[PDB]
Amino acid sequence: DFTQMFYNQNVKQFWLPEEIALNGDLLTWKYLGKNEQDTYMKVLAGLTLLDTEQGNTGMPIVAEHVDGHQRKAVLNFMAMMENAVHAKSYSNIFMTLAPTETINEVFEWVKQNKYLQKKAQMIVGLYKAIQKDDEISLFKAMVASVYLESFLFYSGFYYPLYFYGQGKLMQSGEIINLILRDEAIHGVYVGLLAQEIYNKQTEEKKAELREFAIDLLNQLYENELEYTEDLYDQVGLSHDVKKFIRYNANKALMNLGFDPYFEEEDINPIVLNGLTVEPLKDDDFYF
């Protein structure tokens, strides 16, 4: 009942980072403190890693196991967006704002950062555990994918949105909003596929799947807290970002057909502002 409308929405949302000129951010970037620039680079690098794996691994593997040519076409399109559009856009931003050495250093930093490695290990592990014709392993990977789309990106998205909302780094911010617009529909779509599998189960099996989903969310959440503190303490925003990731965790649960898990909190209003030819017949020669 939904794939065709998602197909149409995905293809009509198609974009390339080159459509957005980035040289306009040069001055507002120059004006940020060293702490702010550091957090910003690292935040986008963490996002780049997530999209790299979502494009290389997550979306293609889910596409492989989901039945139906139209469902596969949507998932293939989403996969392309992840690595050919989203992951690449971050390099466009980096290449504009930062010198090569700072770019090299931040990519080295993703490799050695323990929270980013842990979250990649956990998410990609679940993708690679999918067994052919085994719907339960597929469900688990789809939960992981929804958590990546609708929860994990948001510790990263906070900062570009926070600046956009203050009228700073607005070209980079425009790119990020386009990425976010895509991930929102990706999270909903994968959520609907996960619910399909969940709804086939016995009540006992469903109870176990909810346990899996909630245990996984909590494990990812605890890691994301440490990641958030590590990045945002130097810019004074860790508590604010934490509220934002809890907000989005609830959206991820809802995409999976589950009740919200965290209590509602006031999000920084700045971040909220950041959001023809026919032949000639014989009679044609007579009048």
Binding site: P279, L280, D284
Partner: protein, 683 residues
């Protein structure tokens, strides 16, 4: 935003549900009082102004010296006696931004409308003060409008050529191709549009000096011509414009058309060269019967028969070419080619279509040559003789290249003044003077043909404006009746003036004796048919004017037989693009494209309602795209029966019309006698 622009923009601000057309008089008044009167160089008297203009290399002193200063002063007073007022902002804006003489720094206005008209009249009169006053009255009344080249450049030292239309025949040789490139660059340098006939060039894959598959075809020559026209861009303000014409039976016809496809490769695309196709009746006959047709390699025909393919009658020679083994040909689908032409005209508006048999069945100078191609505007249809440009130190065989200087009658003003005869004769005299004063130093065939043929083009404009301002639908039978009568009278009086000029000068045009004017075959329909209006409403429009009868045409035929004709060609209806604004007239004899013309000049947009547009006549100002193109074809064919040359005929097509509709329009135009089709404009 200037005040006049603000007033003009108030046109579209509807008040009481109707456009505020009266804002244009206010707009033009404010424009004058606040820009033109301020920015007009002040001279104490006409003597000081003329001395300043001549001294500063503005006005040529050759034509002014023929008059005593009293005569010049009298002519200038005659120009100013009318108290001419531009009725709309656009007319005055166009004049004072394109034609009004401005200082070398382009900051001040040296010429008013009256000064320009007086200078043009003095140039025309060639020393005749009364003739100059008659020209001043003719132009100030706006009954006759000299073409943009003549009007802008007349009497100016920096002026370019007063003639702007050139047709060149290209012979099938490297020497001739190089000479054609050189002449095209030379004529573009003068600012005139140059049209070339490529039908004599051998097709791609023909042998050069018994070496097979060596020739590059007409497309390589077209690339050369495109580069030449791009280089001679006339300072770049107006990019160099050239047209290439190819016969439909040429082998390279498909490649010739492919140069205008958007999908075409850049090494084949010809950006700056317009393309026209010459379609004999044989091709239409082949497409009508769905028979398989052949395109011939021109050099094989030339070798077999010693004459060029486009110098022969295809309706008589097609079967012989097909049956001749020594003639090389490849099969084509005539209906597929017609569909390709329609598709190309829809996509880009090209190529121009010339119906060769429609042109040559009424051509008066077939003895000199048949009309093989047209010009860049598609209305010049004259006999041409190719030149033989030989090696250096070898004498060249100069042929005849076509050129004509243009003028337009203002139909509305000619009918209001009831001065068809006098206006036509004065326009013929001015065109003859322009032709006699032209001398092209790098186009030997152009200059020789100008001397020998004395061809002039007298067009008309404001047909739709006149009809709408008189409660007549453009497509209605009454409109065609008026056009028939008016253009019959124009042809009669232009022939009478040509014969009178031949009698006064004692000379006719070269090879006049073999023309249909000399034998009387031209006047058959005029001596046998009455062209008086058949509707009382139309007949009333001509009240006060004598409409020639069959007896008058018999007398004119006898007079021509006695004295001959000075001009080989007299009448051609050119587009008259930008000078129509100055005259506040609709363009040529075409129907108006828009009721109100919205244009952006600088960073301010301007609105130009069609002249005389009002609530009462709003419905009669029907736009061309809303018109039945069959009725437009009927009107143009009615006019064309009295024009010896062609008529620039633009097709106005809606986006919903298929290629079949365009093909049917072209087929109906060919059926109705239409000689050329200029452009396919889509809304």
């Amino acid at each position: 935003v200037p005040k006049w622009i603000q007033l003009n923009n108030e046109i579209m601000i509807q008040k009481d549900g109707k456009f505020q057309f009266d804002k244009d008089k206010e707009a033009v008044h404010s424009y004058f009082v606040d820009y033109i009167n301020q920015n007009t160089v002040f001279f104490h008297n006409l003597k000081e102004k003329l001395d300043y203009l001549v001294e500063n290399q503005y006005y040529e002193e050759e034509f002014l010296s023929l008059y005593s200063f009293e005569d010049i002063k009298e002519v200038f007073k005659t120009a100013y006696a009318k108290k001419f007022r531009f009725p709309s902002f656009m007319s005055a804006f166009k004049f004072y931004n394109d034609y009004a003489l401005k200082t070398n720094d382009k900051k001040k206005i040296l010429e008013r409308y009256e000064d320009r008209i007086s200078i043009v009249a003095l140039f025309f009169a060639n020393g005749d003060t009364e003739k100059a006053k008659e020209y001043v009255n003719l132009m100030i009344n706006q009954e006759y409008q000299p073409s943009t080249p003549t009007f802008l450049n007349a009497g100016r030292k920096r002026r370019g050529e007063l003639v702007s239309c050139f047709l060149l025949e290209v012979n099938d040789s490297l020497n001739d191709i190089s000479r054609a490139i050189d002449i095209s660059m030379q004529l573009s340098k003068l600012g005139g549009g140059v049209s070339l006939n490529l039908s004599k060039l051998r097709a791609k894959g023909e042998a050069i000096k018994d070496v097979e598959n060596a020739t590059k075809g007409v497309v390589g020559v077209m690339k050369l011509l495109d580069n030449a026209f791009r280089y001679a861009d006339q300072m770049g303000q107006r990019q160099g414009s050239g047209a290439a014409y190819l016969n439909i039976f040429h082998r390279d016809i498909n490649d010739f058309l492919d140069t205008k496809k958007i999908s075409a490769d850049e090494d084949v695309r010809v950006k700056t060269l317009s393309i026209g196709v010459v379609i004999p009746d044989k091709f239409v006959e082949l497409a009508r019967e769905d028979k398989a047709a052949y395109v011939f390699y021109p050099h094989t025909i030339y070798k077999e028969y010693g004459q060029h393919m486009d110098e022969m009658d295809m309706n008589e020679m097609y079967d012989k070419f097909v049956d001749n083994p020594r003639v090389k040909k490849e099969k084509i689908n005539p209906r597929k080619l017609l569909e390709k032409l329609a598709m190309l005209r829809s996509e880009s508006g090209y190529p121009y279509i010339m119906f060769q048999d429609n042109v040559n069945k009424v051509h008066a100078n077939n003895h000199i040559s048949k009309v093989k191609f047209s010009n860049l505007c598609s209305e010049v249809l004259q006999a041409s003789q190719v030149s033989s440009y030989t090696d250096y130190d070898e004498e060249d065989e100069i042929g005849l290249d076509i050129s004509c200087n243009l003028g337009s009658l203002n139909i509305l003003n000619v009918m209001e003044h009831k001065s068809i005869e006098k206006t036509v004769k004065l326009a013929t005299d001015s065109l003859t003077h322009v032709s006699e004063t032209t001398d092209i130093r790098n186009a030997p065939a152009v200059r020789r043909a100008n001397k020998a043929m004395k061809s002039i083009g007298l067009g008309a404009m404001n047909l739709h404006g006149y009809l709408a301002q008189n409660g007549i639908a453009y497509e209605s039978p009454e409109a065609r009746d008026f056009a028939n009568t008016f253009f019959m009278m124009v042809n009669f009086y232009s022939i009478q003036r040509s014969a009178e000029i031949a009698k006064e000068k004692g000379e006719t045009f070269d090879q006049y004796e073999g023309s249909t004017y000399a034998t009387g075959e031209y006047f058959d329909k005029y001596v046998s048919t009455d062209f008086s209006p058949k509707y009382e409403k139309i007949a009333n429009l001509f009240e006060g004017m004598h409409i020639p009868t069959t007896e008058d045409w018999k007398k004119l035929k006898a007079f021509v037989a006695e004295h001959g004709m000075y001009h080989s060609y007299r009448l051609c209806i050119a587009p008259t693009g930008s000078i129509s604004y100055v005259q506040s007239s609709t363009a040529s004899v075409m129907p108006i494209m828009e009721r109100i013309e919205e244009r952006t000049y600088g960073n301010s947009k301007t609105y130009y309602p069609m002249p005389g547009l009002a609530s009462n006549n709003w419905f009669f100002y029907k736009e061309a795209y809303d018109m039945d193109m069959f009725k437009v074809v009927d009107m143009i064919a009615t006019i064309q029966q009295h024009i010896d040359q062609g008529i620039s005929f633009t097709l106005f097509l809606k986006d919903t019309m298929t290629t079949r509709d365009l093909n049917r329009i072209d087929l109906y135009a060919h059926h109705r006698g239409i000689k050329t089709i200029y452009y396919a404009r889509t809304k």
